[PDB]
């Protein structure tokens, strides 16, 4: 597979920090946290347990 070094190359199309770990803020307060934080976009699912 497409191991870490290839992710760090392909990320120069998203152009966000090639760490994958970014200076996140909080929408309610305009703050920025004491360290960069893991972010991205995941493929996600809703599941037939259904409450």
């Amino acid at each position: 597979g497409a191991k870490e070094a290839e992710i760090k190359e392909l990320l120069k199309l998203g152009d966000l920090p090639t760490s994958g770990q970014i200076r996140l803020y909080d929408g309610r307060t305009g703050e920025q946290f004491e360290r960069p934080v893991t972010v991205g976009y995941m493929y996600m699912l809703k599941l037939n347990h259904l409450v």
């Binding site: 929408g27 309610r28 307060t29 305009g30 703050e31």
Partner: protein, 310 residues
């Protein structure tokens, strides 16, 4: 329309530093917009006044000492970045702080080197221990209404600063909590609609019962993005809300009032003239604040729209 000119009717003070603060009625849940969009405004570009730089009779560097203090010197760096105030005028003012002999170091030990009010008497700074002890400092103070780091001021950060002139960021506002909830409005018939709740809390200097009524209308600085971005106001209405004189439901404001007296009265949930008729000069005081010109003589013009007491 159901943007029903939704005034801040329900405030509920908790004592000279904290109120409930609520906004109603709202569009089928719209406290979810306001309670997170406007709450960011209330943390961006706000008023008040505070300490910004300091010059002290021993702190030529932080690794120093003063045999007679109890902080020695370094635990004085505790309430500077901590003392706050209000100020009539322009964005630079000055104090000194001049304790001699045994004691704390306190508002009762200040001297006014400029235009500075002090709604923070309880902000004790440090101590002294002998019948011949002393300490002295200058303090720089600013008001503005926005923020910059103490060492990213960048152009105004290359001035002559003596070996003893300590340096701070834009500390100008003393608030200690702001919360957020959403539940139903009071509006006793228009009830498909919500309220925002924000439970703000301070250190004295402002109750959230003052720090709202132009402090929130900073929204007038967030609207170039959305409501005629250009030069093209179009024909479409405001479509209103009237309920008329002298109806028994009308707000206490319909007695004609005297500054935030209007806010701190309606905060008792006595928002309306109909029950103010109970408030005879025998048990009248139950309200927050409401301390002077309001309280004094309005009781005879109350009888000119036409109400009475007895």
């Amino acid at each position: 329309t159901e943007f029903l000119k939704p005034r801040l009717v329900d405030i509920e003070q908790v004592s000279s530093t904290h109120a409930k603060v609520t906004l109603e009625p709202l569009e089928r849940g719209f406290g979810h917009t306001l309670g997170n969009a406007l709450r960011r405004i209330l943390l961006s570009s706000m008023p008040g006044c505070a300490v910004t730089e300091v010059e002290i009779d021993g702190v030529l560097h932080e690794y120093s000492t003063k045999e007679g203090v109890q902080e020695d010197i370094l635990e004085i760096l505790l309430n500077l970045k901590g003392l706050a105030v209000r100020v009539q005028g322009k964005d630079e003012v000055i104090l000194t702080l001049n304790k001699s002999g045994i004691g704390p170091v306190t508002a009762a030990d200040i001297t006014h080197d400029g235009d500075v009010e002090i709604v923070k008497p309880q902000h004790v700074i440090c101590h002294l221990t002998d019948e011949n002890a002393s300490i002295s400092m200058r303090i720089k103070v600013q008001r503005g209404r926005g923020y910059v780091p103490a060492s990213t001021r960048i152009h105004s950060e290359e001035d002559e600063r003596p070996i003893g002139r300590l340096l701070v960021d834009a500390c100008y506002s003393p608030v200690e909590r702001i919360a957020y909830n959403v539940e139903a409005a009071r509006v006793e018939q228009r009830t498909d609609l919500d309220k925002l709740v924000i439970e703000m809390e301070t250190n004295g200097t402002i109750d959230p019962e003052e720090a709202i009524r132009r402090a929130a209308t900073i929204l007038a600085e967030q609207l170039e993005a959305f409501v005629d971005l250009r030069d093209v106001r179009q024909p479409e209405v405001k479509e209103e809300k009237p309920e008329f004189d002298p109806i028994l439901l009308l707000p206490v404001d319909d007695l004609e009032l005297t500054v935030r007296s209007a806010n701190c009265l309606k905060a008792e949930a006595i928002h309306y003239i109909g029950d103010l008729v109970q408030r005879t000069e025998v048990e009248l005081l139950k309200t927050p604040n409401l301390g002077k010109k309001s309280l004094t003589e309005i009781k005879d013009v109350l009888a000119s729209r036409g109400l009475s007491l007895g």
